[PDB]
Structure formats: structure tokens, C-alpha cells
Scaffold this motif. Structure first.
Motif, PDB file in Angstrom:
ATOM      1  N   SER A  39       0.828  -1.201   0.000  1.00 56.12           N
ATOM      2  CA  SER A  39       0.000   0.000   0.000  1.00 56.12           C
ATOM      3  C   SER A  39       0.865   1.256   0.000  1.00 56.12           C
ATOM      4  CB  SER A  39      -0.929  -0.006   1.197  1.00 56.12           C
ATOM      5  OG  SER A  39      -1.587   1.221   1.359  1.00 56.12           O
ATOM      6  N   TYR A  40       0.418   2.273  -0.727  1.00 54.30           N
ATOM      7  CA  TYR A  40       1.072   3.577  -0.701  1.00 54.30           C
ATOM      8  C   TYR A  40       0.072   4.684  -0.384  1.00 54.30           C
ATOM      9  CZ  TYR A  40       4.981   1.161  -2.935  1.00 54.30           C
ATOM     10  OH  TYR A  40       6.014   0.298  -3.224  1.00 54.30           O
ATOM     11  N   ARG A  41       0.562   5.759   0.224  1.00 52.78           N
ATOM     12  CA  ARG A  41      -0.282   6.902   0.553  1.00 52.78           C
ATOM     13  C   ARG A  41       0.351   8.202   0.068  1.00 52.78           C
ATOM     14  NH1 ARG A  41      -2.659   7.014   6.518  1.00 52.78           N
ATOM     15  NH2 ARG A  41      -3.475   5.001   5.784  1.00 52.78           N
ATOM     16  N   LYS A  42      -0.477   9.090  -0.474  1.00 52.70           N
ATOM     17  CA  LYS A  42       0.002  10.368  -0.987  1.00 52.70           C
ATOM     18  C   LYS A  42      -1.031  11.467  -0.757  1.00 52.70           C
ATOM     19  CE  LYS A  42       2.720  13.197  -3.281  1.00 52.70           C
ATOM     20  NZ  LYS A  42       4.008  13.649  -2.687  1.00 52.70           N
ATOM     21  N   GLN A  43      -0.567  12.621  -0.286  1.00 51.70           N
ATOM     22  CA  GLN A  43      -1.444  13.766  -0.074  1.00 51.70           C
ATOM     23  C   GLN A  43      -1.846  14.397  -1.403  1.00 51.70           C
ATOM     24  OE1 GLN A  43       0.168  16.725   2.559  1.00 51.70           O
ATOM     25  NE2 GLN A  43      -1.618  18.080   2.398  1.00 51.70           N
ATOM     26  N   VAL A  44      -3.151  14.517  -1.625  1.00 52.56           N
ATOM     27  CA  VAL A  44      -3.667  15.036  -2.886  1.00 52.56           C
ATOM     28  C   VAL A  44      -4.793  16.036  -2.649  1.00 52.56           C
ATOM     29  CG1 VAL A  44      -3.053  12.946  -4.144  1.00 52.56           C
ATOM     30  CG2 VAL A  44      -5.323  13.156  -3.123  1.00 52.56           C
ATOM     31  N   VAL A  45      -5.066  16.861  -3.655  1.00 49.08           N
ATOM     32  CA  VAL A  45      -6.220  17.751  -3.621  1.00 49.08           C
ATOM     33  C   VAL A  45      -7.230  17.384  -4.703  1.00 49.08           C
ATOM     34  CG1 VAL A  45      -7.026  20.127  -3.807  1.00 49.08           C
ATOM     35  CG2 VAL A  45      -4.839  19.641  -2.698  1.00 49.08           C
ATOM     36  N   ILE A  46      -8.443  17.046  -4.281  1.00 55.35           N
ATOM     37  CA  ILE A  46      -9.484  16.621  -5.210  1.00 55.35           C
ATOM     38  C   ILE A  46     -10.702  17.533  -5.124  1.00 55.35           C
ATOM     39  CG2 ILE A  46     -11.031  14.764  -5.898  1.00 55.35           C
ATOM     40  CD1 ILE A  46      -9.018  12.807  -4.620  1.00 55.35           C
ATOM     41  N   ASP A  47     -11.032  18.176  -6.238  1.00 56.30           N
ATOM     42  CA  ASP A  47     -12.200  19.048  -6.301  1.00 56.30           C
ATOM     43  C   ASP A  47     -12.155  20.097  -5.196  1.00 56.30           C
ATOM     44  OD1 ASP A  47     -13.156  17.551  -8.427  1.00 56.30           O
ATOM     45  OD2 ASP A  47     -14.468  16.369  -7.253  1.00 56.30           O
ATOM     46  N   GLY A  48     -10.973  20.664  -4.974  1.00 56.10           N
ATOM     47  CA  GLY A  48     -10.840  21.757  -4.027  1.00 56.10           C
ATOM     48  C   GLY A  48     -10.680  21.270  -2.600  1.00 56.10           C
ATOM     49  N   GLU A  49     -10.791  19.961  -2.406  1.00 56.33           N
ATOM     50  CA  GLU A  49     -10.668  19.372  -1.079  1.00 56.33           C
ATOM     51  C   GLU A  49      -9.286  18.755  -0.881  1.00 56.33           C
ATOM     52  OE1 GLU A  49     -14.004  17.048   0.461  1.00 56.33           O
ATOM     53  OE2 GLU A  49     -12.569  15.552   0.915  1.00 56.33           O
ATOM     54  N   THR A  50      -8.628  19.130   0.212  1.00 50.33           N
ATOM     55  CA  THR A  50      -7.341  18.545   0.565  1.00 50.33           C
ATOM     56  C   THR A  50      -7.520  17.278   1.393  1.00 50.33           C
ATOM     57  OG1 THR A  50      -6.219  20.702   0.548  1.00 50.33           O
ATOM     58  CG2 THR A  50      -5.140  18.900   1.732  1.00 50.33           C
ATOM     59  N   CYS A  51      -6.927  16.184   0.929  1.00 49.04           N
ATOM     60  CA  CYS A  51      -7.146  14.877   1.539  1.00 49.04           C
ATOM     61  C   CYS A  51      -5.964  13.950   1.279  1.00 49.04           C
ATOM     62  CB  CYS A  51      -8.397  14.373   0.819  1.00 49.04           C
ATOM     63  SG  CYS A  51      -8.182  14.102  -0.956  1.00 49.04           S
ATOM     64  N   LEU A  52      -6.005  12.766   1.879  1.00 49.05           N
ATOM     65  CA  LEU A  52      -4.998  11.743   1.620  1.00 49.05           C
ATOM     66  C   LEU A  52      -5.558  10.640   0.727  1.00 49.05           C
ATOM     67  CD1 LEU A  52      -3.457  11.472   5.203  1.00 49.05           C
ATOM     68  CD2 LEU A  52      -2.691  12.858   3.261  1.00 49.05           C
ATOM     69  N   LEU A  53      -4.796  10.271  -0.296  1.00 48.29           N
ATOM     70  CA  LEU A  53      -5.162   9.152  -1.156  1.00 48.29           C
ATOM     71  C   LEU A  53      -4.307   7.926  -0.848  1.00 48.29           C
ATOM     72  CD1 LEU A  53      -6.811   8.028  -3.504  1.00 48.29           C
ATOM     73  CD2 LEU A  53      -5.057   8.928  -5.049  1.00 48.29           C
ATOM     74  N   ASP A  54      -4.951   6.864  -0.376  1.00 49.97           N
ATOM     75  CA  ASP A  54      -4.243   5.646   0.001  1.00 49.97           C
ATOM     76  C   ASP A  54      -4.602   4.498  -0.938  1.00 49.97           C
ATOM     77  OD1 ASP A  54      -3.212   3.360   1.172  1.00 49.97           O
ATOM     78  OD2 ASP A  54      -3.625   3.959   3.164  1.00 49.97           O
ATOM     79  N   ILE A  55      -3.626   4.058  -1.726  1.00 49.70           N
ATOM     80  CA  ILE A  55      -3.875   3.071  -2.768  1.00 49.70           C
ATOM     81  C   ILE A  55      -3.230   1.734  -2.424  1.00 49.70           C
ATOM     82  CG2 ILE A  55      -3.573   2.481  -5.194  1.00 49.70           C
ATOM     83  CD1 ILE A  55      -3.404   5.522  -5.747  1.00 49.70           C
ATOM     84  N   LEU A  56      -4.039   0.680  -2.403  1.00 50.77           N
ATOM     85  CA  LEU A  56      -3.552  -0.654  -2.075  1.00 50.77           C
ATOM     86  C   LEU A  56      -3.458  -1.523  -3.324  1.00 50.77           C
ATOM     87  CD1 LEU A  56      -2.876  -3.023  -0.120  1.00 50.77           C
ATOM     88  CD2 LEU A  56      -5.350  -3.386   0.037  1.00 50.77           C
ATOM     89  N   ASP A  57      -2.279  -2.090  -3.558  1.00 50.43           N
ATOM     90  CA  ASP A  57      -2.110  -3.110  -4.585  1.00 50.43           C
ATOM     91  C   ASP A  57      -2.148  -4.508  -3.975  1.00 50.43           C
ATOM     92  OD1 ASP A  57      -1.699  -1.523  -7.024  1.00 50.43           O
ATOM     93  OD2 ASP A  57       0.051  -0.826  -6.053  1.00 50.43           O
ATOM     94  N   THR A  58      -3.024  -5.356  -4.504  1.00 54.02           N
ATOM     95  CA  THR A  58      -3.170  -6.717  -4.003  1.00 54.02           C
ATOM     96  C   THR A  58      -2.609  -7.731  -4.994  1.00 54.02           C
ATOM     97  OG1 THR A  58      -5.380  -7.085  -4.941  1.00 54.02           O
ATOM     98  CG2 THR A  58      -5.256  -6.022  -2.781  1.00 54.02           C
ATOM     99  N   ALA A  59      -2.307  -8.928  -4.501  1.00 56.97           N
ATOM    100  CA  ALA A  59      -1.686  -9.958  -5.325  1.00 56.97           C
ATOM    101  C   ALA A  59      -2.255 -11.336  -5.002  1.00 56.97           C
ATOM    102  CB  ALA A  59      -0.177  -9.949  -5.129  1.00 56.97           C
ATOM    103  N   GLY A  60      -2.342 -12.187  -6.019  1.00 61.48           N
ATOM    104  CA  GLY A  60      -2.950 -13.493  -5.844  1.00 61.48           C
ATOM    105  C   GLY A  60      -4.429 -13.406  -5.527  1.00 61.48           C
ATOM    106  N   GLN A  61      -5.254 -13.342  -6.568  1.00 53.59           N
ATOM    107  CA  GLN A  61      -6.687 -13.135  -6.396  1.00 53.59           C
ATOM    108  C   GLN A  61      -7.275 -14.168  -5.440  1.00 53.59           C
ATOM    109  OE1 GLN A  61      -5.098 -13.711  -9.280  1.00 53.59           O
ATOM    110  NE2 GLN A  61      -4.760 -11.522  -9.670  1.00 53.59           N
ATOM    111  N   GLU A  62      -7.063 -15.443  -5.752  1.00 52.94           N
ATOM    112  CA  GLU A  62      -7.482 -16.524  -4.868  1.00 52.94           C
ATOM    113  C   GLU A  62      -6.639 -16.545  -3.596  1.00 52.94           C
ATOM    114  OE1 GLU A  62      -7.237 -20.036  -7.122  1.00 52.94           O
ATOM    115  OE2 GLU A  62      -9.036 -19.733  -8.206  1.00 52.94           O
ATOM    116  N   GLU A  63      -5.373 -16.160  -3.726  1.00 52.71           N
ATOM    117  CA  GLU A  63      -4.447 -16.186  -2.599  1.00 52.71           C
ATOM    118  C   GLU A  63      -4.726 -15.034  -1.639  1.00 52.71           C
ATOM    119  OE1 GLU A  63      -0.618 -16.108  -4.267  1.00 52.71           O
ATOM    120  OE2 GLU A  63      -0.618 -18.124  -4.931  1.00 52.71           O
TER     121      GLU A  63
END
Length: 166
Positions: A39-63
């Protein structure tokens, strides 16, 4: 300090790692994520709103076992990544989708379908098919290129907007 914890899913062979890393580094990156969830996190501004975007990469769909299901606690929304040349990935996303829905004992969440490698000529997915599959799932269809053409950013914003609109 609003946080958006969004989960990226898809079959092996796409640039799930590239999607996250490029956004957070604002750079063209092929670097591959580790053999386990990341997982990674980055501070971003969306539609005038300041917030944190936290994106998770997953692996092994069944796993994606109970050990990884812990992340499902986020449960906000899902970005589905497939390759235009990878037909089978559609089934893997669907099955993976069914599993994560079972973990959440629910099925009404924000989702976006994103297709990579649209610049590759030797593919076996017609965009007409891909978009129709997205339409049947009631989710946006976005074509992107890990090279430079970023469509993933808007996809995340769509996920956020859908969260805001519930």
C-alpha cells in the motif's frame, strides 16, 4: 484530514504497481511491487478538497486470504485493472470481485474498469466488448497507458466522487 482508502485489483500481467507508483511519484515508472500486498499513501487535492489518497495493490486473487482480507476493512471502492491483450483477465477480475464482495457481505460499492496497453497492436480484447462488460457492471470504462497517458487518476477521482454521492 479526510482519507480515501481505495483498493486496486486485477490479474497478473498488468501494471498495478505502475498505477500507484507513477501517481505518487508523478513519474513514468515500471518498477514492480513485491510478491505480497503493498500500500502507498500520498497527499492530494481533489475538487478543491485537501485529503490523503491511500492506494492498495493486491496480489494473488485466490491467494487473497483472510490475512489479506484485513485490508477489506477499508471497503471504500475498487479500481479494476486489465490489459487490452489479456482476455482472461476479465474472468479473474469477476471471480476476484465475487470473493471480495463475500468478505464484505454486501454488493453496492464504487468501481471503475481500466484498460492498459491500449498502444499494443497484438491484442485480443475489442474495446466495444470491454466497455460493454463495464456497462453491464454499471461501472465506468477508462482506457489508459502506463507509458504516459494517465487515465487512472480520473478513475480514482470517480471512485471518490461516487463515495461522496454514496
Amino acid at each position: 484530514m479526510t482519507e480515501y482508502k481505495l483498493v486496486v485489483v486485477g490479474a497478473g500481467g498488468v501494471g498495478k504497481s505502475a498505477l500507484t507508483i507513477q501517481l505518487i511519484q508523478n513519474h513514468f515508472v515500471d518498477e514492480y511491487d513485491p510478491s505480497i500486498e503493498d500500500s502507498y499513501r500520498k497527499q492530494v487535492v481533489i475538487d478543491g478538497e485537501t485529503c490523503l489518497l491511500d492506494i492498495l495493490d493486491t496480489a494473488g486473487q485466490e491467494e487473497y486470504s483472510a490475512m489479506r482480507d484485513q485490508y477489506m476493512r477499508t471497503g471504500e471502492g475498487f479500481l479494476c485493472v486489465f490489459a487490452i491483450n489479456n482476455t482472461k483477465s476479465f474472468e479473474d477480475i469477476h471471480q476476484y470481485r465475487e470473493q471480495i464482495k463475500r468478505v464484505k457481505d454486501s454488493d453496492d460499492v464504487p468501481m471503475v474498469l481500466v484498460g492498459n496497453k491500449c498502444d499494443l497492436a497484438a491484442r485480443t480484447v475489442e474495446s466495444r466488448q470491454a466497455q460493454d462488460l463495464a456497462r453491464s457492471y454499471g461501472i465506468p470504462y477508462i482506457e489508459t497507458s502506463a507509458k504516459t497517458r494517465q487515465g487512472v487518476e480520473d478513475a480514482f477521482y470517480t471512485l471518490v466522487r461516487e463515495i461522496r454521492q454514496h
